[PDB]
Design a protein around this ligand. Sequence first.
Ligand SMILES: O=Cc1ccccc1
Ligand SMILES: [N+]
Ligand SMILES: [N+]
Ligand SMILES: [N+]
Ligand SMILES: [N+]
Ligand SMILES: [N+]
Ligand SMILES: [N+]
Ligand SMILES: [N+]
Ligand SMILES: [N+]
Ligand SMILES: [N+]
Length: 119
Amino acid sequence: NESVIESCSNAVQGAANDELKVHYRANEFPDDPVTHCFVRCIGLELNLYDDKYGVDLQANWENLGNSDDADEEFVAKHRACLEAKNLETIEDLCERAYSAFQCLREDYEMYQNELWSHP
Ligand SMILES: O=Cc1ccccc1
Ligand SMILES: [N+]
Ligand SMILES: [N+]
Ligand SMILES: [N+]
Ligand SMILES: [N+]
Ligand SMILES: [N+]
Ligand SMILES: [N+]
Ligand SMILES: [N+]
Ligand SMILES: [N+]
Ligand SMILES: [N+]
């Protein structure tokens, strides 16, 4: 939603940027340090992500237009994708969040046309 986007653009140094905000409202998130932190900010604010507990897969399932329990294969595939990113070894919190987000990026794109992954 606009609110969280506006707030995160202010919370993140450099993110209050016309050209980047154009991408963000268009659901594109370039692989750059400002966007990394912006993506982290949105994940934290929407309760989709946590620096320690990783991705909440049920919350993302629901953010993808579902109101039911996540499909088992959705959970399994993303848990595996996320484990493969070795997030706990990424020291920079924004880079870690962006890397975790990359596991869900396609789901969000297909949609656009708690199940913490690290309990
Ligand atoms: O901030 C990281 C993140 C991860 C998964 C979904 C949304 C955001
Ligand atoms: N902004
Ligand atoms: N952030
Ligand atoms: N949060
Ligand atoms: N959540
Ligand atoms: N539900
Ligand atoms: N549910
Ligand atoms: N359930
Ligand atoms: N399932
Ligand atoms: N991981």
